[PDB]
Design a binder for these strands. Structure first.
Ligand code: SF4
Ligand SMILES: O=P([O-])(O)O
Ligand SMILES: O=P([O-])(O)O
Length: 219
DNA sequence: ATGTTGCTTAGTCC
DNA sequence: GGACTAAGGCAACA
């Protein structure tokens, strides 16, 4: 299917009952946003359909993409990620605001699961269900040369996608594995506030990942 | 009030 | 693999 068909069918998806409930249950639970409209639906990917670099996250944040409708938009993860994308020359401007004119250059963003999960922890079954959408979405990204897994969950999801074994591809920040057709699989700590504010992942470390992805992508 | 909640990793143990 | 949790720093939240 094409992208219009993808977005159309993805947004009406309700295969995971626990997530279909959670994505709406969190609406109004955060003080700063009570009374405001929430997307509270599956989140479609965002970015350059001709991207050579794919940044693969974990899932929607309850008050992040689940609220704004755009990956990494409206929370601490995006406040960290978007400025770095611009600093690396991969976007039109530093901030991402729903409904704005932000453009990504050579990069596309999406995640393993597309509906906000309790505790930011989808079950093995929810991962298997949404993996069908990963097949469709990545199927619509023909130019990707570098797949960047943001976190352990994201990597394991990509490994499953590429039919690779966990034992031969452990998760460690900076890890780089070869893929068929001269492509690449890179692993990075996730951009979560839990990682960036605690010091496990710094702005310097992540910009480095982005620069390396550009290098391996011929950008 | 100032204590709690909430935003992955890495290791334990079965 | 699966279930569990200490640790990490900060600040909205209550
Ligand atoms: S997580 Fe994915 S598969 Fe499950 S309901 Fe949401 S879009 Fe559908
Ligand atoms: O809502 P996310 O894309 O920041 O997880
Ligand atoms: O932000 P608070 O401290 O007024 O609740």
């Amino acid at each position: 299917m094409d992208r219009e068909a993808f977005v159309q069918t993805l947004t009406a998806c309700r295969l995971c009952p626990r997530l279909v409930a959670w994505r709406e249950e969190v609406v109004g639970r955060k003080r700063a946003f009570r009374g405001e409209p929430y997307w509270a639906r599956p989140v479609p990917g965002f970015g350059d359909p001709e991207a050579r670099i794919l940044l693969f996250g974990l899932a929607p944040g309850a008050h992040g993409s689940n609220r704004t409708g755009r990956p990494f938009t409206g929370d601490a993860s995006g406040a960290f990620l978007y400025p770095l994308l611009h600093e690396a020359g991969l976007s039109s401007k530093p901030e991402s605001l729903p409904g704005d004119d932000l453009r990504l250059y050579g990069v596309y963003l999406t995640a393993a699961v597309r509906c906000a999960p309790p505790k930011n922890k989808p079950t093995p079954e929810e991962l298997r269900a949404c993996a069908r959408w990963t097949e469709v979405e990545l199927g619509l990204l023909p130019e990707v040369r570098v797949y960047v897994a943001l976190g352990r969950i994201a990597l394991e999801a990509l490994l499953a996608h590429f039919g690779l074994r966990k034992s031969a591809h452990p998760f460690r920040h900076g890890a780089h594995y070869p893929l068929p057709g001269g492509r690449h699989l890179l692993a990075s700590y996730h951009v979560s506030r839990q990682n960036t504010q605690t010091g496990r992942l710094t702005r310097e470390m992540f910009l480095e990942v982005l620069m390396e992805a550009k290098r391996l992508a011929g950008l």
